[PDB]
Amino acid sequence: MDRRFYGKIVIKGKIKAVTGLHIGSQRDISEIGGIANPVIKDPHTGLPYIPGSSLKGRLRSLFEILVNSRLGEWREKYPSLANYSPGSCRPDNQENCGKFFNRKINRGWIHVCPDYETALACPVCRLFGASGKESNFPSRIIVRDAFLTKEWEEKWRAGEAITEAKIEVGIDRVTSQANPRTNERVVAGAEFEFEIIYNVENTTHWRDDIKNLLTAMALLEDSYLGGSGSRGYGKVKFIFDSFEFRPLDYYRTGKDEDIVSIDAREKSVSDILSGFDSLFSEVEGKL
Amino acid sequence: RFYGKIVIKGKIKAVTGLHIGSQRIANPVIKDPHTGLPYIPGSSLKGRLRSLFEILVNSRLGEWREKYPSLANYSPGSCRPDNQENCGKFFNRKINRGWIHVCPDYETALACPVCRLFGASGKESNFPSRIIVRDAFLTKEWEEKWRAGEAITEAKIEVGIDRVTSQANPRTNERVVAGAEFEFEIIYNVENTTHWRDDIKNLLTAMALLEDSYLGGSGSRGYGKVKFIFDSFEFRPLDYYRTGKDEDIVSIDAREKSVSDILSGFDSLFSEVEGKL
Amino acid sequence: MDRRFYGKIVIKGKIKAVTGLHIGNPVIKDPHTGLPYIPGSSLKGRLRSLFEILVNSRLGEWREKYPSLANYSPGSCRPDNQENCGKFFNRKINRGWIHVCPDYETALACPVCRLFGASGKESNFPSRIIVRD
Amino acid sequence: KGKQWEAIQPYFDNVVREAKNFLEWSPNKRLANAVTVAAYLTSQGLKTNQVRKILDMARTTELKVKRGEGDIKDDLVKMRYLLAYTVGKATGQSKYSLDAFHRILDPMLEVLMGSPKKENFEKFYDFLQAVVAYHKFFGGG
Amino acid sequence: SGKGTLKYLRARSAYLELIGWDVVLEILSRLGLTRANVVFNAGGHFMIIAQNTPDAVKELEEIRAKAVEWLYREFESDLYLAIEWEPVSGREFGREGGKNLFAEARKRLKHKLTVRKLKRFGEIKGLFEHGHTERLAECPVCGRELPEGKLEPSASDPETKVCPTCNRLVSLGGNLPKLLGFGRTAKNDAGVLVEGPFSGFVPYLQGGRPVGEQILVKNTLNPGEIPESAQFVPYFVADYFKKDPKGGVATFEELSMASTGTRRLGVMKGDVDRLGEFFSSMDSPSKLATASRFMDYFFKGYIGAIIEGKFGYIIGDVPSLRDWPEEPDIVVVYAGGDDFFIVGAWDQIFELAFRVRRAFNAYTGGKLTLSVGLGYFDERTPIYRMADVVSERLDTAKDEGRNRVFVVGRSRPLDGKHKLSYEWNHYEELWRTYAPRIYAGNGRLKGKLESKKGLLWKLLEIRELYVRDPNDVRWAYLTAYLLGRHGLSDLFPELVGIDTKAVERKEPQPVYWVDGVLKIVLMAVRR
Amino acid sequence: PKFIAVKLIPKGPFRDIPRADTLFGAIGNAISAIHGQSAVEELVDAFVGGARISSAFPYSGDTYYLPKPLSVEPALEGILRYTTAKRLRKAKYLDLKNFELALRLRPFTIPEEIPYARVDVPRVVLDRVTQDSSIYFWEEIRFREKSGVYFLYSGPREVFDGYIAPAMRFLGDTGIGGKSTWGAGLFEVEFHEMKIDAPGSEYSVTLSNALPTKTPVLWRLLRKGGWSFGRRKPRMTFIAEGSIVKNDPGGMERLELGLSHEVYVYGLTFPLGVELPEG
């Protein structure tokens, strides 16, 4: 029922790994000698990269929890939060319990609204996406895989390293028994170029849906991005290159009339700061 | 009748690795049954340019009632909530469960800007397609890197994580290795010289949307970002097919991008065609 | 069950060494900038090991306020090869004994493992502090 | 046990230097000998963490053979002296274990400076990973 | 097409046997012969001994011309009954000297079959005639072209307009458990479901009285409720079917939900090889009627007792994911005497094929062999593709050695040295070595191999390096290392080392054979 | 008997090996575009007089395959072991070297590998609002790297270059049937000359669909019907390629179908001489 199209707010920018960044994926593919904890690297270049699933998942899981806490007062702002209660469905094996975290993936519980009509009003699944039997609300954001910036390509050409091997150890409290290991993590300070496209489907609710994306990002700068994380290995920081609106009249004609917002030297918390009405003011003229 | 065939060639650059699958590594990409090189189907690229151009019209079902007829007979939205074919709403063809826009006859499909180009069956009419989206295979540079020991697929293990207990639930996805090159070919048919113009403007509009969206696969997790690099525009006139004497109109677009080809070069490169029609 | 979120108390500051420090014969350094640095695991795994030892002596004073301290006697599983028993240090990592409560609701009640995090078999309770480099 | 380390090593060492070039045999011989290479390195300790700088040095230009450069001069320089620096930093009981591992690779490195770059170093790098892989299977890592 | 799931195929395979008896019993009455004059009748192929009068040959041309013109209108040349006769002498039966007269008299008769199968519809005379009839359409189930208006609505949905001859085969598709035989009677009778080329067949139900002049009685030789005036014609048929919660025949979508492990439909189609060369060994009508009846009763009667779960002394132990249930979920679609086609739960059809072959190898005294071509297809798959792929997996396992089983769709090099389908004895030792060390039973793995199901996919990745390059020995150390890191150095000692005996024999390496033995263990777990 | 072979080097995967009547309907629909309406009926009168084409047959890197005659089956025992008498009969195609031998009833050899592979690809149908799947199967002929499909032509070359060689350049850019909007029936064309020696005798195998007027000698029957402009054609009893007629010219039956023009169905035989056994 009624899917439309008005443009695509494109968020261009650069992810700056302030602390060592770690993602991790498979190893030993026709290969013997490694450190056995390698960050995912694409095969054509052999350089590390931030995936889209590792960024869309961590922007999601930091925005289930914000909703899970303020579930009580947002039923008036957003309908279909009255189907839910704060908590997990884990103590009793139900795919639809009274609580919020309702869908069993394999053995874990992830909030996904079961219908198109239920997910249309839900703040989480209207943005990040949903699924079900026969109803299936699809997403709006396309989080794309982030690769190193023009500069950090050349530091792989000039000879500078990009991955470091940190040795961590475990210690018994009694016999001081050293239990060591090694990690491959991204060198601290490397910088990946991300891009997050927001498919504007309804002009009624994009202001309260861009603000939710900049809420999940502003939590991610205080939390970590994948990896061991609680011991420093995350600490990621968004550096916005350009917001661009990419309207509907752009795609037919080809005129460079796409609305460009000013995000030169601003924090992710400064966009959502009082001035979000002023940064995206000229988007209101196009609706 | 028939006038000529604007053949578009160029390159598809899967900038971010893309995945299609056969449902038979848990989700393997499609490959050839003999050589094992992956490819893009012609259907996965005709239908994807159809979905993206369908939605844009869906927004403009009002404003295109003077340029195109047979959109006054539609209202925006689906027909899923009442299983009623050719009702007032736009997507009015239930194939098995999916509701797709297909016009039912000929004389409304001739004016509808999707079914005129991409084609529509209906009952008693069967207006055939006008484009022919030929398959895309890897460039001979990449066919040789297949022989040069490089792996052209790679497994990405994504995981699904419990919110409270932070358990791990992995899965595998065999994608095409990012950075690859596919060589595509889209062969338009010039049936009517009246609306000759708009079908090349409405096809390149769907590629402006496909370059910002994804090309199949997980996509919103990052597995699209297909990019179009054009290499040749042609015309292949009706004079050419009768005798074979090579006098076809050629437009050079060797370094032209798909937004630098719609209006940046569209009056420019197809200026030579408009005298011949 | 029921992970929630009200905010994030941020403790900024500056570690000072009045006497000379060592990590690990070179002190490990930031590669991109060359400078030495105190890691995250050497500051979160050091506070845990000066708090699991502090809780070990006091299992009579905290047990009225914290549940799941009654499930352990103050001791060590280093002589007796048993996973979960009366002795307080329960996980053999490969060869070392670190106190990790093996469940969510044990670690929800534990004073250590509600703060410095806890693994488990199908429980895996996650931490509440994140200590950066 | 160690009595196999005395006989099988002295059976293999005259076969080692007599095939000093890395392009000896691309057939079943270089894999059949490579199990015997790790067979008398089994009874020795042969820790890999000191070799991790050498193998990552072999790893970082293995991509650079693959359309990165056509020059393996700067890499194979760095592999020769660091492998001499292996006993050149680490001595002791691990030195008698690492002297026998020195005498196989040092005849093959000197080929690789004047060798082809697409060829004859892949024939080394395949003999590199044959030594490591069986060594994990006989009980060492 | 994708209609009529397994109540309909099981109806066709007994409908074909009705036409097979409606011609043979027509020859016996019209010529004055009893049922002793049938030498055999199994699998769409019969042989009747009769007299040489001028009077009878006038009758046999009337039988043949009336059968074929029925088989042309009712089926648009999809089925043809090629009837040939040949006069012999009395001495032609027994052997004379050292020369088998009865074989060369059978070669005079089989060649008249081979010419007649070429001239496929000769006795029609309206065959190549053209007359354009207004507005025909085709059936959605079986694809026969009928004029409009004859297409009537179905018994499933009133939306689709199926053949009239399909609704008689869906209604028969429900009356299969409620059945005790058929009654051969005239065409213009009441209560006849299906018509043959000479007569009509009334169902003789569970509770009911038999009607007609001749009564076909399935699977029993005793005239239980039959009148004294009637003729008793016993036919046997392989008839096992798993009953649903109702009193009826199972579905495609019931068998695979109740399978072991993941859900899939396990089709097998296998046949006895070199059997036409075997029936030429016989040299008298006493000898051929026996050999075509003991071979007949295996796939008719004794295949039921195998699926019921018997004869452990004769069979032994088979490659089996779990021990045999009390009521197994197996649907015998067709089993002719030389041939069979059995669907079921896809990890019991796997167990059954080694259980049929083992019992067949002791029914025959070790002399004749089977060639079973196993397929594994999803429930959402049309049957005309399932029979198409499995019969091609059959001829894969037929042209190679004729004593070999196809198990799984498996990738091979383009040399020709590597043949796909497993020999029977060669496979059942690959189960004895590989399976009880990586598999324990009932869809679960051995000790400390759980949380390492990623390993067995990686171990089947190293098999995919052997296929792009057979000459490479990259698979030898990757086998040894991956067992080392995971701590599993004890498993697979045959794969860690090269076989110098296998190189000189120009036979596949032991990493080539491991694909099919791993996948069955892997697919029996949820994977 | 020097035949103008027409090679069709495929780009995308074919829906089928094109039957002889799939080609002539494809060629006639080409000439109605690149030559107008009156030239098609002129094209039909040319094939009535002398011109004949054949069905399409595969080729694998110049090794041109041809259909096995049915002349070999009644006396395959007179040719030549029981395993060989079946695998030689089970075959469907013979090589250009081996097709000439079976016309003279010589012992011969089957090919080892078939060039094409009929594979079935699953596709999907997605609604535009909810992205909800709707699977359906689909199957097509997938050819190898060198291989492809060809067919034959024998007749006056002024009818060839005037009609067919334009049509096979127009049909390189719109397919020979199938879902030719998914790039299925497309190809590129090159023409050649090809020679098959025929022994002079009154019996003849047909290299196209026979549709006889008198009953043939030994025939493998075939039922197919086409689709002209959305109108179903009735199923007709063609004979498959490799059946034996004696002095039969074949025919074409025009059909009504409710179109503006009449619609012909190519069934003209393509006789090459054959030696039959006794029956």
Ligand SMILES: [Zn+2]
């Ligand atoms: Zn939701």
Ligand SMILES: [Zn+2]
């Ligand atoms: Zn339309």
Ligand SMILES: [Zn+2]
């Ligand atoms: Zn604790």
Ligand SMILES: [Zn+2]
């Ligand atoms: Zn029917």
